[PDB]
Amino acid sequence: PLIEVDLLNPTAASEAKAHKMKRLVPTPNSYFLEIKCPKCGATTTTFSHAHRQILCQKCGQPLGQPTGGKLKLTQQCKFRIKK
């Protein structure tokens, strides 16, 4: 670009827009989360971009469907980000 920004201190917004690899220090866009079951109270921890059917550990209200890039959680499944 003709106009140039600092290459050591990129903004929070600028790094978020960039590709997951083309950042200053590459970081994954994925995360680990747990899903409370609709059927029971147990929380099953799983990858954000899981590539298989996600079942509860108790039963199996299947909690997610793998769809080419991110888990398709059911509309009644609530999750939080595991930090």
């Binding site: 140039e4 200053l24 590459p26």
Partner: protein
């Protein structure tokens, strides 16, 4: 494929200065790339540089100040005998007072002036005006 990382770095730096850019980024960092920059700093051709660690042979950001006309690497690093110095400078450098070669020797990576002082030859890396 990336055969010479130093060649990629010096082409990035030369391209940045022709466009007048303030700072440039080099993706693969090496010991040899760092040594070449240190030689260029001692002659005050680049202000400074910083090295970020990406756990994957991290990146280098170099600050340029309107002084580096051209830094280029030299393909296969010829074994430069001490008697072949002035033959190389007469070919690669603009005059007898302006530029400096870069050589890798057993005493480290040094330019032609102090390698002559230390009385040691070695493979030639590159140059800069």
């Amino acid at each position: 494929v990336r055969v010479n990382v130093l060649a990629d770095a010096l082409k990035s730096i030369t391209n940045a200065e022709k466009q007048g850019k303030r700072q440039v980024m080099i993706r693969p960092a090496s010991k040899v790339i760092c040594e070449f920059l240190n030689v260029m700093m001692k002659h005050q051709y680049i202000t400074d540089y910083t090295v970020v660690d990406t756990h994957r042979s991290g990146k280098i950001v170099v600050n340029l100040n309107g002084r580096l006309n051209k830094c280029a690497v030299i393909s296969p690093r010829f074994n430069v005998t001490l008697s072949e110095f002035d033959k190389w400078e007469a070919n690669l450098l603009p005059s007898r007072h302006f530029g400096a070669l870069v050589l890798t020797t057993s005493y480290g990576i040094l330019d032609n002036t102090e390698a002559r002082a230390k009385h040691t030859g070695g493979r030639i890396l590159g140059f800069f005006y």
